Design a protein around this ligand. Structure first.
Ligand SMILES: [Mg+2]
Ligand SMILES: [Mg+2]
Ligand SMILES: [Mg+2]
Ligand SMILES: [Mg+2]
Ligand SMILES: [Mg+2]
Ligand SMILES: [Mg+2]
Ligand SMILES: [Mg+2]
Ligand SMILES: [Mg+2]
Ligand SMILES: [Mg+2]
Ligand SMILES: [Mg+2]
Ligand SMILES: [Mg+2]
Ligand SMILES: [Mg+2]
Ligand SMILES: [Mg+2]
Ligand SMILES: [Mg+2]
Ligand SMILES: [Mg+2]
Ligand SMILES: [Mg+2]
Ligand SMILES: [Mg+2]
Ligand SMILES: [Mg+2]
Ligand SMILES: [Mg+2]
Ligand SMILES: [Mg+2]
Ligand SMILES: [Mg+2]
Ligand SMILES: [Mg+2]
Ligand SMILES: [Mg+2]
Ligand SMILES: [Mg+2]
Ligand SMILES: [Mg+2]
Ligand SMILES: [Mg+2]
Ligand SMILES: [Mg+2]
Ligand SMILES: [Mg+2]
Ligand SMILES: [Mg+2]
Ligand SMILES: [Mg+2]
Ligand SMILES: [Mg+2]
Ligand SMILES: [Mg+2]
Ligand SMILES: [Mg+2]
Ligand SMILES: [Mg+2]
Ligand SMILES: [Mg+2]
Ligand SMILES: [Mg+2]
Ligand SMILES: [Mg+2]
Ligand SMILES: [Mg+2]
Ligand SMILES: [Mg+2]
Ligand SMILES: [Mg+2]
Ligand SMILES: [Mg+2]
Ligand SMILES: [Mg+2]
Ligand SMILES: [Mg+2]
Ligand SMILES: [Mg+2]
Ligand SMILES: [Mg+2]
Ligand SMILES: [Mg+2]
Ligand SMILES: [Mg+2]
Ligand SMILES: [Mg+2]
Ligand SMILES: [Mg+2]
Ligand SMILES: [Mg+2]
Ligand SMILES: [Mg+2]
Ligand SMILES: [Mg+2]
Ligand SMILES: [Mg+2]
Ligand SMILES: [Mg+2]
Ligand SMILES: [Mg+2]
Ligand SMILES: [Mg+2]
Ligand SMILES: [Mg+2]
Ligand SMILES: [Mg+2]
Ligand SMILES: [Mg+2]
Ligand SMILES: [Mg+2]
Ligand SMILES: [Mg+2]
Ligand SMILES: [Mg+2]
Ligand SMILES: [Mg+2]
Ligand SMILES: [Mg+2]
Ligand SMILES: [Mg+2]
Ligand SMILES: [Mg+2]
Ligand SMILES: [Mg+2]
Ligand SMILES: [Mg+2]
Ligand SMILES: [Mg+2]
Ligand SMILES: [Mg+2]
Ligand SMILES: [Mg+2]
Ligand SMILES: [Mg+2]
Ligand SMILES: [Mg+2]
Ligand SMILES: [Mg+2]
Ligand SMILES: [Mg+2]
Ligand SMILES: [Mg+2]
Ligand SMILES: [Mg+2]
Ligand SMILES: [Mg+2]
Ligand SMILES: [Mg+2]
Ligand SMILES: [Mg+2]
Ligand SMILES: [Mg+2]
Ligand SMILES: [Mg+2]
Ligand SMILES: [Mg+2]
Ligand SMILES: [Mg+2]
Ligand SMILES: [Mg+2]
Ligand SMILES: [Mg+2]
Ligand SMILES: [Mg+2]
Ligand SMILES: [Mg+2]
Ligand SMILES: [Mg+2]
Ligand SMILES: [Mg+2]
Ligand SMILES: [Mg+2]
Ligand SMILES: [Mg+2]
Ligand SMILES: [Mg+2]
Ligand SMILES: [Mg+2]
Ligand SMILES: [Mg+2]
Ligand SMILES: [Mg+2]
Ligand SMILES: [Mg+2]
Ligand SMILES: [Mg+2]
Ligand SMILES: [Mg+2]
Ligand SMILES: [Mg+2]
Ligand SMILES: [Mg+2]
Ligand SMILES: [Mg+2]
Ligand SMILES: [Mg+2]
Ligand SMILES: [Mg+2]
Ligand SMILES: [Mg+2]
Ligand SMILES: [Mg+2]
Ligand SMILES: [Mg+2]
Ligand SMILES: [Mg+2]
Ligand SMILES: [Mg+2]
Ligand SMILES: [Mg+2]
Ligand SMILES: [Mg+2]
Ligand SMILES: [Mg+2]
Ligand SMILES: [Mg+2]
Ligand SMILES: [Mg+2]
Ligand SMILES: [Mg+2]
Ligand SMILES: [Mg+2]
Ligand SMILES: [Mg+2]
Ligand SMILES: [Mg+2]
Ligand SMILES: [Mg+2]
Ligand SMILES: [Mg+2]
Ligand SMILES: [Mg+2]
Ligand SMILES: [Mg+2]
Ligand SMILES: [Mg+2]
Ligand SMILES: [Mg+2]
Ligand SMILES: [Mg+2]
Ligand SMILES: [Mg+2]
Ligand SMILES: [Mg+2]
Ligand SMILES: [Mg+2]
Ligand SMILES: [Mg+2]
Ligand SMILES: [Mg+2]
Ligand SMILES: [Mg+2]
Ligand SMILES: [Mg+2]
Ligand SMILES: [Mg+2]
Ligand SMILES: [Mg+2]
Ligand SMILES: [Mg+2]
Ligand SMILES: [Mg+2]
Ligand SMILES: [Mg+2]
Ligand SMILES: [Mg+2]
Ligand SMILES: [Mg+2]
Ligand SMILES: [Mg+2]
Ligand SMILES: [Mg+2]
Ligand SMILES: [Mg+2]
Ligand SMILES: [Mg+2]
Ligand SMILES: [Mg+2]
Ligand SMILES: [Mg+2]
Ligand SMILES: [Mg+2]
Ligand SMILES: [Mg+2]
Ligand SMILES: [Mg+2]
Ligand SMILES: [Mg+2]
Ligand SMILES: [Mg+2]
Ligand SMILES: [Mg+2]
Ligand SMILES: [Mg+2]
Ligand SMILES: [Mg+2]
Ligand SMILES: [Mg+2]
Ligand SMILES: [Mg+2]
Ligand SMILES: [Mg+2]
Ligand SMILES: [Mg+2]
Ligand SMILES: [Mg+2]
Ligand SMILES: [Mg+2]
Ligand SMILES: [Mg+2]
Ligand SMILES: [Mg+2]
Ligand SMILES: [Mg+2]
Ligand SMILES: [Mg+2]
Ligand SMILES: [Mg+2]
Ligand SMILES: [Mg+2]
Ligand SMILES: [Mg+2]
Ligand SMILES: [Mg+2]
Ligand SMILES: [Mg+2]
Lengths: 63, 100
RNA sequence: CGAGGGACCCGGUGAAAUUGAACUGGCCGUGAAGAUGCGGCCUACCCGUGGCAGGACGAAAAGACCCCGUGGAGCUUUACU
RNA sequence: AAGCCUCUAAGCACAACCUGCGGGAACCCGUACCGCAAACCGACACAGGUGGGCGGGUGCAAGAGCACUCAGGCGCGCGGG
RNA sequence: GGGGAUGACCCCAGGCGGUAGGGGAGCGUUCCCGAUGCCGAUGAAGGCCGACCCGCGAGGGCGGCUGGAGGUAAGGGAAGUGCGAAUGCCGGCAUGAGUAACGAUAAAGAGGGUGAGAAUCCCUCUCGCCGUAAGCCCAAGGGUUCCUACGCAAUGGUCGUCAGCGUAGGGUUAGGCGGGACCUAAGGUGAAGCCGAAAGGCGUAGCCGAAGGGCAGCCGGUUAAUAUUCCGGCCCUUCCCG
RNA sequence: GGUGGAGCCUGGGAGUGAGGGCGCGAGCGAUAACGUCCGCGUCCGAGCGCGGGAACAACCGAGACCGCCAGCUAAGGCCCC
RNA sequence: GCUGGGGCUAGGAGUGAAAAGCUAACCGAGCCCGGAGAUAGCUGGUUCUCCCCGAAAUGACUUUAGGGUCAGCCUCAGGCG
RNA sequence: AGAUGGUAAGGGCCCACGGUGGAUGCCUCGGCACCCGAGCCGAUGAAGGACGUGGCUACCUGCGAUAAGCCAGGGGGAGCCGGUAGCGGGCGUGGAUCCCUGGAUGUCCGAAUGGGGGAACCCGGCCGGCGGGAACGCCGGUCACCGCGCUUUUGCGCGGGGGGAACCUGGGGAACUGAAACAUCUCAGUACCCAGAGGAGAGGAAAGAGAAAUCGACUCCCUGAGUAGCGGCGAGCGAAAGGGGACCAGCCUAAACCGUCCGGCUUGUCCGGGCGGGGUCGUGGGGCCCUCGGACACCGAAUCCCCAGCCUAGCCGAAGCUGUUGGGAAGCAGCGCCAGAGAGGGUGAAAGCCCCGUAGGCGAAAGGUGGGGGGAUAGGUGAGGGUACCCGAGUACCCCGUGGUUCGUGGAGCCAUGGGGGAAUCUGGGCGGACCACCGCCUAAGGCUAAGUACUCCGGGUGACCGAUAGCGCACCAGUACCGUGAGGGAAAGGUGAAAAGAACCCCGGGAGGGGAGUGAAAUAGAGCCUGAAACCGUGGGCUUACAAGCAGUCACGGCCCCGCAAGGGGUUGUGGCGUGCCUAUUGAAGCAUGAGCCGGCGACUCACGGUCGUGGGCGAGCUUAAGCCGUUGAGGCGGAGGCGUAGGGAAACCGAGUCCGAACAGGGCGCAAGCGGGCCGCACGCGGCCCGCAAAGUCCGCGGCCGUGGACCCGAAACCGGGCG
């Protein structure tokens, strides 16, 4: 039957108009104590390289 | 359970045999194999001495049938013979007002 | 050493697993490292009958020992539920 | 437990039961053959297994053991060198 | 890259080993549009050949023999579409090979007869084996295998005229023998009753349930095949009637 | 300089992730292994197509589009097979 | 003690003078059907032809080393030149 | 001293002819899938069988001691006594055989049902009959259980038991697999077990839905939408509202009040129950009393009656001859004919005009259906005020433990409840997702309901469906032979010829088997007989082998033989030279690693729904249909519910060519406009934007690669669970 949208992907990443995949940076949620204002602050929606051709495949029917 | 296009009795004419056309009297009709045995094809069929109905050594007996799709019934005064019609108060066979 | 039932010959019926095709020699070397088939030398007319089983890594069973599989079961306990 | 022997309840004692004398009726299934093998069970005319009874005589002390033989069967369903 | 008659035809330069792979171009089979058509007894599909023709090919034409009634362009499409391997499957035929075996080492020999054909079938004379059986009588079990007549298509571990093999015709006779119309044990079913989602499971009385109890038959003859049943003698039992 | 099945970007599509030999630079080993694991390159794998090394994948030459009863050469040889 | 006849006990169960034996010729949990065309990163097989290019056995990670995701190597198409 | 020819017990290669062998080619009496019509049977004895019946009968089929059958009616009109032969018999225009409907009989078993029973057997009771009939036997009725109404107990009538290919509902209910282990989850409430009913079932007239003061029973399809949501937030599972459609039907009953009878009895003035009037509601309805009154007019079945029509048998139904090859004309040649019929099949071969039927039109005595259409009846019909008597009791509601909806305990609603507590009757309650107030919707704790939807034992028509290793397991005398105690497993086996015209007769031979002769177009078309391949086994001819060593071959020279007028070609190897079978798995195979005895046949990368990319088209800021409706039954249109994109950011609010991070126009991430075909010279070189490439710009369809869910390239487990057989 019709394929199902991966709800983990739909809740974690956000695909833009021109094919790019926008997701947050890691190493921030659990422990944030011994980090500078740079390491706390620079969580700025990193981009994913050569994996979005295997990441927009499960953001498929509604994109 | 196909019926026939000829009766018992009524004079019939062959069309597509080894011989092409001679007048005969249909005996008998036999609609199981759908084949008339009218008067035409005598056969040389073998027969064992055992019985004996012919007490020397004979080699010919009763007949051989012809397929009923070849033959056609004549109306008795016409020369017309090909067609069939029915249904005038009794199921007869009348074409080109020739009788049955 | 002797006797009987087989083995051997003849008359009759007459299978079986195996089987790539084979016109299938020995030695010394090479080749996946144990050669009838590759190279060199030597021997050998063709085809059989009875026997031995040394070879064809002969046959049987997709190792029965060992290892792997996030294989499956039997059993144990203060391993979990 | 039943047949049979005996005593009684309801009932019946013109009935009912017992012994004789004469006359009738007695129904449904099995019934052959093999049954310790060629016919049963073993894919087979298979050296295997299959319950009960009669299962002789003579001699070995006795005996269903052993040896032979009555009645009964059999030469084993491939033979000849 | 060029002559660019755009030539989808010829020149120039370079290249053309290849697995797993990536890509391009074709052949063959079933069916369908073309097909209310065309080819086909002067011979269709299929089978056996060709040293013939074309194509780098899967192949396609043409010629000959057999065959007896179907096949189908060109241009396209849909695939149950191409086999040598899977200790693949199914059917046939080989090797093993005229080889092992032919089934308890109880044992055969001979003369006649039938018959086309006899070590094997029938009769006769010897020899051997079992004889607490390799003999006889029943219950299991098997289901006509029993007998006669006619035969060897197939079977009998050989042959076979024989057969427990085939065809046809007969053959099993019961008040007293073994079972039911008698009874009961283990066990099963099961009025009442009890329990469980349903199917159902226990279960008194009663019923079924046997090589258990009771019940009236012994001897001999008869057929090729039936016998305590048919027959001869003889004795009994159950029930009913007067 | 270098027009080459050279490169660069995007998209589609696989396969591979057991390697091995040889020379050098090394480790472990024993300065042993056709032993194990790296790097620099080649070859086999995928060139078991060819010639030589007798035979042999990696030692040498050479990179097989097809055909010819034509020559010249690479490695290796010129006594005969 | 042996045995005939009629029965009862059964699959995570029965039975067992206890071997994990036997339960219809194979029992560390039978047989038949269905789920079920279960799963298998584990073997084997995978069928017409021609042409062009052409690999890898490497790196980074995984209750993982015989399998994987990405990168490296290859091919096709479209652009840069 | 020498040497070539030569011998073939036998072999090898090639050629020709045979046998075994049954593939290929061609046909169907066959089943497969779709479409509709239709869809329960049965104590008045089902589905299915055992046994028996034919003058002779092995089997299949039809029947049941009335036994390949009997009676009545309709069709049918001349051949019959089934497949099915053979001997022997009789029937039919005075309407035989055959088909359909209604009847009768219908042994025995089987729900089995008098009882027992190991199914196809045995034994009975009561009432009548028969045999001489008391004892013995037979025949014809009745005798099982359960739930109801009457019958005060007795008994009499009405139903149920069992089966049915698939479907449906309710009660139980798994495991392997997926998460690359795996216990919550998925598989899945699926397979499977039980119960009842049906031609469907279930559900159904709101204590609904959910935001609009909106819709208005229920079922099914497409959308919404793989959206919201749930989930070790992993695997994965997955709506609902609304809309476009198919269909459209709504009702009955308890309660309050009233009449009769019965029960307890204080026979009082009330209680308990069955009947008759009275009520089916959210706009609140309804009981009693008063007023408006008039219905005596209308609606109307889902009930009943009749009928159109359909089914179980059928019928009519146009149009051709001659000559030739041949055994056969339908081919071919000439002249024609019909068409509301030129679909198909058979006809010795290839036919519109030879036959059966297709086009079209008629056909019911009798029995089913009659959802379609006309009639009848039951049943419904109204407004204001007063009274607050009634509106579905261990029930709503609360707590704990549960299932379903996407809801897995999370903030956890709603629908049913296993247990505990526990009321009210419109100023009473439930819902709008913990909960409170407001505002909206509806009346639960009783029941029924057609139509639209699923499936095919069976009937027929169709098929880019098949053609005996295919197709269902069986085209054939198949769920048979055979295996297994049993549950169960499970085959192979089609073809002579136009017509058996099936080979009379002679001879050999015991027979079988043939050789002749004859029929036959053909007899290698001979009776399991069309075509008849290969492996395999032989016979006859050419070449070569008894001094040569090889995965058996290739090249060269020569000899021998055979074709061709010749040139040349074909079969063989005596010698020389060169040479490690195929595939897999591998760093690596001729491998003493695996598979293969040979031949013929079967077989392995598709398909549904979707995503991405490329390609051929259509249209373009638009593209585009699904479900369904209307048409001949091989013809298309209608049908904008819906989907993608045109504007995107942000978690959302919200904003927008900008958004967010942030106090901010710092700064950054997302998009944005950047110009392709470009006569655009409108005459201002800012050129605004134009003939204009179907494109930046996207959609629909086709064709390919790949992917996900489905078994997904095929084969193969050790095992697990459910139901049963032993
Ligand atoms: Mg969307
Ligand atoms: Mg003629
Ligand atoms: Mg012996
Ligand atoms: Mg011999
Ligand atoms: Mg060696
Ligand atoms: Mg060699
Ligand atoms: Mg050698
Ligand atoms: Mg030996
Ligand atoms: Mg007593
Ligand atoms: Mg006897
Ligand atoms: Mg006797
Ligand atoms: Mg005995
Ligand atoms: Mg036996
Ligand atoms: Mg014997
Ligand atoms: Mg024996
Ligand atoms: Mg004994
Ligand atoms: Mg003495
Ligand atoms: Mg003595
Ligand atoms: Mg003794
Ligand atoms: Mg004697
Ligand atoms: Mg003897
Ligand atoms: Mg003998
Ligand atoms: Mg013997
Ligand atoms: Mg040139
Ligand atoms: Mg050049
Ligand atoms: Mg190439
Ligand atoms: Mg390749
Ligand atoms: Mg076909
Ligand atoms: Mg013609
Ligand atoms: Mg010819
Ligand atoms: Mg064909
Ligand atoms: Mg012929
Ligand atoms: Mg195929
Ligand atoms: Mg083969
Ligand atoms: Mg083999
Ligand atoms: Mg075989
Ligand atoms: Mg010999
Ligand atoms: Mg020998
Ligand atoms: Mg030997
Ligand atoms: Mg011997
Ligand atoms: Mg002997
Ligand atoms: Mg003698
Ligand atoms: Mg003699
Ligand atoms: Mg004599
Ligand atoms: Mg003798
Ligand atoms: Mg018996
Ligand atoms: Mg028997
Ligand atoms: Mg017999
Ligand atoms: Mg005799
Ligand atoms: Mg014989
Ligand atoms: Mg014999
Ligand atoms: Mg004789
Ligand atoms: Mg006999
Ligand atoms: Mg006999
Ligand atoms: Mg009794
Ligand atoms: Mg009696
Ligand atoms: Mg009793
Ligand atoms: Mg008693
Ligand atoms: Mg008892
Ligand atoms: Mg009992
Ligand atoms: Mg019981
Ligand atoms: Mg007894
Ligand atoms: Mg007794
Ligand atoms: Mg007597
Ligand atoms: Mg390159
Ligand atoms: Mg690895
Ligand atoms: Mg590695
Ligand atoms: Mg390495
Ligand atoms: Mg190494
Ligand atoms: Mg080394
Ligand atoms: Mg290379
Ligand atoms: Mg080699
Ligand atoms: Mg060399
Ligand atoms: Mg090499
Ligand atoms: Mg080259
Ligand atoms: Mg030179
Ligand atoms: Mg015993
Ligand atoms: Mg089980
Ligand atoms: Mg246990
Ligand atoms: Mg126990
Ligand atoms: Mg056992
Ligand atoms: Mg086991
Ligand atoms: Mg399986
Ligand atoms: Mg499953
Ligand atoms: Mg994997
Ligand atoms: Mg290349
Ligand atoms: Mg990669
Ligand atoms: Mg390019
Ligand atoms: Mg000779
Ligand atoms: Mg021939
Ligand atoms: Mg032949
Ligand atoms: Mg044959
Ligand atoms: Mg009744
Ligand atoms: Mg019946
Ligand atoms: Mg019958
Ligand atoms: Mg009449
Ligand atoms: Mg009439
Ligand atoms: Mg007849
Ligand atoms: Mg006759
Ligand atoms: Mg007759
Ligand atoms: Mg007459
Ligand atoms: Mg009549
Ligand atoms: Mg009659
Ligand atoms: Mg009738
Ligand atoms: Mg009767
Ligand atoms: Mg009964
Ligand atoms: Mg019973
Ligand atoms: Mg009486
Ligand atoms: Mg009387
Ligand atoms: Mg009387
Ligand atoms: Mg009834
Ligand atoms: Mg269902
Ligand atoms: Mg349920
Ligand atoms: Mg599980
Ligand atoms: Mg798993
Ligand atoms: Mg679920
Ligand atoms: Mg029922
Ligand atoms: Mg039922
Ligand atoms: Mg319906
Ligand atoms: Mg319905
Ligand atoms: Mg209903
Ligand atoms: Mg209902
Ligand atoms: Mg209501
Ligand atoms: Mg809706
Ligand atoms: Mg609507
Ligand atoms: Mg009432
Ligand atoms: Mg009323
Ligand atoms: Mg009526
Ligand atoms: Mg007609
Ligand atoms: Mg006509
Ligand atoms: Mg003519
Ligand atoms: Mg025709
Ligand atoms: Mg004509
Ligand atoms: Mg019609
Ligand atoms: Mg009716
Ligand atoms: Mg209607
Ligand atoms: Mg009130
Ligand atoms: Mg919950
Ligand atoms: Mg609730
Ligand atoms: Mg409760
Ligand atoms: Mg509530
Ligand atoms: Mg609420
Ligand atoms: Mg209601
Ligand atoms: Mg059908
Ligand atoms: Mg078949
Ligand atoms: Mg065939
Ligand atoms: Mg049996
Ligand atoms: Mg002639
Ligand atoms: Mg002949
Ligand atoms: Mg002849
Ligand atoms: Mg033949
Ligand atoms: Mg034959
Ligand atoms: Mg034919
Ligand atoms: Mg033939
Ligand atoms: Mg010869
Ligand atoms: Mg010499
Ligand atoms: Mg020589
Ligand atoms: Mg050579
Ligand atoms: Mg292959
Ligand atoms: Mg490899
Ligand atoms: Mg090998
Ligand atoms: Mg070898
Ligand atoms: Mg291996
Ligand atoms: Mg082998
Ligand atoms: Mg910005
Ligand atoms: Mg920026
Ligand atoms: Mg733009
Ligand atoms: Mg696609």
């Amino acid at each position: 039957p019709k394929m199902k949208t991966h709800k983990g992907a739909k809740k974690r990443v956000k695909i833009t108009a021109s094919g790019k995949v926008v997701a947050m940076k890691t190493g921030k949620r659990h422990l944030n104590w011994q980090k500078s204002g740079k390491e706390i602050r620079q969580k700025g929606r990193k981009f994913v390289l050569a994996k979005p051709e295997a990441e927009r495949i499960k953001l498929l029917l509604p994109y | 359970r196909v019926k026939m296009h000829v009766k018992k009795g009524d004079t019939v004419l062959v069309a597509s045999g080894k011989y092409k056309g001679r007048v005969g009297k249909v005996k008998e009709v036999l609609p199981k194999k759908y084949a008339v045995i009218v008067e035409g094809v005598n056969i040389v069929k073998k027969a064992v001495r055992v019985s004996p109905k012919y007490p020397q050594g004979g080699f010919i007996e009763k007949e051989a049938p012809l397929h009923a799709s070849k033959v056609r019934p004549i109306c008795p005064a016409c020369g017309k013979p090909t067609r069939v019609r029915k249904k005038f108060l009794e199921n007869g066979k009348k074409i080109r007002v020739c009788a049955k």
